[PDB]
Amino acid sequence: SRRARIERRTRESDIVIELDLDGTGQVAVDTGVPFYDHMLTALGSHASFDLTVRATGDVEIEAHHTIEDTAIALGTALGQALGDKRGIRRFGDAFIPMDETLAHAAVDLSGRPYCVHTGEPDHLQHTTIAGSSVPYHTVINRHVFESLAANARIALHVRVLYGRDPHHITEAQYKAVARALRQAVEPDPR
């Protein structure tokens, strides 16, 4: 009913997305960027989407092309699956407490791309989240939200009210976007 399959093959990367808006949080994400997988898994889950994301890309350069291409493909999928947008809440918002962090997100499935990203502390624009694999530069948080909004053709406002930990700040943001989308895509009983 509200499903979309997107394939996006560039010189930089290969993306397959399968998205059902009316899911139960059945989510599997594999981008080669494990922190990004964790964020996109928290997004799909907290949005009660069924989401499959399979991505390979030029992670020898860094995560950027794969992160952006995935966010672009995911946006296209959200847009396609929404279709005519008949009888939906359309507007949604969500606060996400995560220990010391508070994030907020607000959406208008308007058909008019716009992203406003505010309140993220300045140290996130050169912070790295690094494990045993390909690292995640938090400077990309904004890039992900803008790419998502641009390609889904929605108004997305993402706010950090406050926070310290870059992992908490990033996850709370992805989760805020997720629960804001969840409210907005729900059928409107009126």
Ligand X SMILES: NCCSc1ncn[nH]1
Binds its own copies by CB under 8 A, chosen from 6, 21, 107, 185: 107
- Residue 65, annotated as binding a ligand: yes
Whether 157 has a binding-site annotation, put simply, is: no
> Which of 145, 148, 106 has its CA nearest to residue 6?
148
Residue 90 contacts ligand X per CB under 6 A = no
Nearer to ligand X, 153 or 167 (CB): 167
Binding of its own copies by 123 (CB under 8 A): yes
Residue 50 lies near Mn ion (rule: CB under 5 A): no
User: Which region, judged by CB under 5 A, interacts with Mn ion, from 68-76, 113-121, 125-133, 156-164?
Assistant: 68-76
Confirm or deny that 68 is annotated as ligand binding. yes
**Which of the ranges 1-9, 13-21, 75-83, 165-173 carries the binding residues for its own copies, by CB under 8 A?**
165-173
20 binds Mn ion (CB under 5 A): no
Closest CA relative to residue 35, chosen from 167, 173, 146: 167
Least distance from its own copies to the Cβ atom of residue 127, Å: 5
Query: Is 88 marked as binding a ligand?
Result: no
Burial of 86 (0-12, 13-18, 19+ CB in 10 A): exposed
Q: Could you say which residues in the range 24-53 bind its own copies, by CB under 8 A?
A: 24-25, 34-35, 37-38, 48
Q: Does 137 appear as a known binding residue?
A: no
Residue numbers at the binding site for its own copies (CB under 8 A): 24-25, 34-35, 37-38, 48, 58-64, 91, 93-100, 102, 106-108, 110, 112-114, 116, 118, 123, 125-135, 137, 139-140, 142-143, 146, 150, 155-157, 159, 161-162, 164-167, 179, 190
